[PDB]
Amino acid sequence: GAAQAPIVAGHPLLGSMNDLLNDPLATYLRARRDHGDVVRFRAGPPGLRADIYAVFSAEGAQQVLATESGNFRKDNVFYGELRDSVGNGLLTSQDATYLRQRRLVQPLFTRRRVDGYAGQVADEAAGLAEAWRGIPGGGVELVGEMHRFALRVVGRILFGTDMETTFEVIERTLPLLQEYALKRGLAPVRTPRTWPTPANRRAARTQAELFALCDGIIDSRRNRESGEDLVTLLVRAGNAEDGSLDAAELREQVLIFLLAGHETTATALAFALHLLARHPEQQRRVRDEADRVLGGPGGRAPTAADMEALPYLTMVLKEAMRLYPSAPVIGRRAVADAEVDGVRIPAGADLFVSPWVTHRHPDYWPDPERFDPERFTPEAEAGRPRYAWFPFGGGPRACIGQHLSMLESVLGLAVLIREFEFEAVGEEEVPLGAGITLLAKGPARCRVIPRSSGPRSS
Ligand code: HEM
Ligand SMILES: CCCCCCCC/C=C\CCCCCCCC(=O)O
């Protein structure tokens, strides 16, 4: 009964190669509009790469990530390039290797443990507010500012008091390593990393610098409510059935927490603020809520308990992640033949599900380009399929850092909203690109007007 997937319209020789280089996100949206919810992207010339399938329905995303998750593995080439760059930690590992890591790391990400990091988030957000009050011109570029803030937040939680000493190195090296692996990962032709090309030599130096830094911090904590940092918790990980992580395993988990938690949260934070800067009525609503909860400009630090008291900001962040999903595609590889929405996905095919497309699917989202936090009332959520929204994925390999990201984002943004008015400036439309991560192709310019002189004793 299963139909052949339609080939997305492209170049007669080169298939979708030029369209995916120039504008992948528009290409994905066109693919759904013209060809349906299960499609295939063809490369050219023939033989360069097998056809890549895509699944855009909420039902199909649930099937691939959850219902039939065992048939859709992390066997894409780009996963192997990530393993080669950061080790085979929680995001890339599979089978028994993954089950050991999950048993050892899931305890570190209980709601209560993650909540204990609220003061680190609050403190870093107060530090950013102090920095912004200090800008003579009152102007920022939100992509860059949130890239820096999000790394400081995840660094504080991983390394505590040692965040400041290691920040510069991670800030400079981590992005270069990710670019090398993901660009290698998506390229149909690549060199062995053993070739001494300039790019391989540059990558090997960067990897060596970052590995030595991580190894030193980890070895320092190997001697080991609680404000304990996450590497200390990783060093302490263990149970009656699984012994502790070794040095190689500790390094691979520290690197994946940084990689998986830095730019993802940064993108959500930047665009939430940019959207509020372009939508004053929604900004007024979040300000009124933050002022009620924290007692206005110059008021108190937010706490973990305040998450339940900031529902509107929480809806704002969900809507920002609907429109600007940090993982716009999620890749898998089919083991055996499958059928999604009456369409065949053959054994061995690479495929992707797409928060980008599903978050804009007209079947689930009226006026899908419109920014509307009220889409995330409990009632509005019940009126759409479960996987209409899935920026953190879903099922057995869903983001372990979802709640942490929301603690960082809700508490961090509440401080900034308590302390600044945001005014968009310049070109307010931000062009986007994408690989497996969302790419800002323009600035999110913003004027930040202080609401107070900052903290004052009482
Ligand atoms: C808004 C921010 C974030 C987004 C959009 C996001 C997105 C995702 C997605 C889509 C996945 C699933 C990938 C797949 O199924 O192949 C994932 C997994 C993961 N994320 Fe996040 N993430 C975010 C924040 C964080 C943070 C702060 C951490 C810090 C620990 C983190 C760590 C991870 C890890 C370790 C995994 C692998 C989980 C597993 O396989 O069990 N993420 N993330
Ligand atoms: C791993 C799934 C394949 C692509 C989906 C992306 C979802 C995984 C998590 C986060 C987004 C990007 C993947 C690499 C993590 C790095 C974080 C980043 O810089 O985006």
Furthest-apart CA atoms within the chain: distance in Å: 73
Question: Exposed, middle or buried: residue 35 (CB in 10 Å: 0-12, 13-18, 19+)?
Answer: middle
Instruction: For residue 77, give the ligand nearest its CA.
Output: 2
Name the one residue in this structure whose structure tokens are 């590992």: 93
> To test ligand 1's pocket by mutation, which of 229, 273, 399, 404 has the most ligand atoms within 8 angstroms of CB?
399
Name the one residue in this structure whose structure tokens are 């509020």: 276
- Measure 376 CA to ligand 1 centroid, in angstroms: 21
Asked if 157 contacts 269 with a C-beta cutoff of 8 angstroms, the reply is: no
Asked if 36 contacts 6 with a C-beta cutoff of 8 angstroms, the reply is: yes
Residue 53: closest CA among 453, 332, 431, 414: 332
Name the residue at shortest CA distance from atom 4 of ligand 2.
330
What is the C-alpha separation between 121 and 119, in angstroms, rounded? 5
Residue 363: closest CA among 86, 61, 130, 40: 61
- Give helix then strand counts, H and E, for the chain: 18, 12
User: Who lines ligand 2 at CB under 6 A?
Assistant: 91, 178, 259-260, 263-264, 326-327, 329-331, 436-437
Residue 186: closest CA among 334, 77, 263: 77
Residue 151: closest CA among 182, 112, 124, 178: 124
Name the residue at shortest CA distance from atom 11 of ligand 2.
327
Enumerate the β-bridge partners of residue 334: 72
What is the C-alpha separation between 338 and 18, in angstroms, rounded? 29
Our answer on whether the CB atom of 267 is closer than 6 Å to any ligand 1 atom is no
Instruction: For residue 178, give the ligand nearest its CA.
Output: 2
Residue 75, number of CB atoms within 10 A of its CB: 15
Would you give the DSSP letter of residue 3? B
Our answer on whether the CB atom of 310 is closer than 6 Å to any ligand 1 atom is no
Residue 126, number of CB atoms within 10 A of its CB: 19
> To test ligand 1's pocket by mutation, which of 73, 120, 229, 264 has the most ligand atoms within 8 angstroms of CB?
264
Residue 266: closest CA among 142, 452, 393, 113: 142
Please report the resolution in angstroms: 1.7
- Strand residue runs (E) in 387-431: 420-424
Element containing residue 228 per DSSP (H, E): none
Q: Give Cα separations from 222 to 162, 231, 318, 372, 405 (angstroms).
A: 15, 9, 38, 47, 27
What is the C-alpha separation between 214 and 165, in angstroms, rounded? 12
Helices (H), 295-371: 311-323, 355-358
What is the C-alpha separation between 124 and 150, in angstroms, rounded? 9
Name the one residue in this structure whose structure tokens are 């809507």: 319
Cα within 13 Å of Cα(188), Cβ side: 13
- For residue 286, which amino acid is it? V
Name the residue at shortest CA distance from atom 8 of ligand 2.
327
Enumerate the β-bridge partners of residue 7: 40
What is the C-alpha separation between 183 and 188, in angstroms, rounded? 10
What is the C-alpha separation between 230 and 324, in angstroms, rounded? 28
What would the two tokens of residue 219 be? Answer: 């070895």
Element containing residue 41 per DSSP (H, E): strand 38-41
Enumerate the β-bridge partners of residue 72: 334
Residues 6 or more apart from 458 whose CB is under 8 A from it?
none
Residues 6 or more apart from 70 whose CB is under 8 A from it?
335
- Measure 314 CA to ligand 1 centroid, in angstroms: 18
Would you give the DSSP letter of residue 301? P
- 45 cis-preceded (ω within 30 degrees of 0): yes
Asked if 411 contacts 116 with a C-beta cutoff of 8 angstroms, the reply is: no
Experimental determination approach used: X-ray
What is the C-alpha separation between 40 and 53, in angstroms, rounded? 4
Q: How many residues does the chain have?
A: 458
Residue 390: closest CA among 311, 435, 330: 330
Name the one residue in this structure whose structure tokens are 């062995």: 192
Our answer on whether the CB atom of 265 is closer than 6 Å to any ligand 1 atom is yes
Phi then psi dihedrals of residue 364, to 5 deg: -115, -20
- Measure 175 CA to ligand 2 centroid, in angstroms: 13
Enumerate the β-bridge partners of residue 421: 449
Instruction: For residue 182, give the ligand nearest its CA.
Output: 2
**Torsion angle (degrees, nearest 10) of CA 354, 276, 429, 176:** -60
- Measure 331 CA to ligand 2 centroid, in angstroms: 10
Residue 378: closest CA among 454, 318, 307: 318
∠311-314-316 over CA atoms, to 5°?
A: 115
Our answer on whether the CB atom of 399 is closer than 6 Å to any ligand 1 atom is yes
Our answer on whether the CB atom of 326 is closer than 6 Å to any ligand 1 atom is yes
Name the one residue in this structure whose structure tokens are 């206005």: 296
Element containing residue 348 per DSSP (H, E): none
Q: What residue segments make up the domains of the chain, in order of their start?
A: 1-458
- Measure 87 CA to ligand 1 centroid, in angstroms: 16
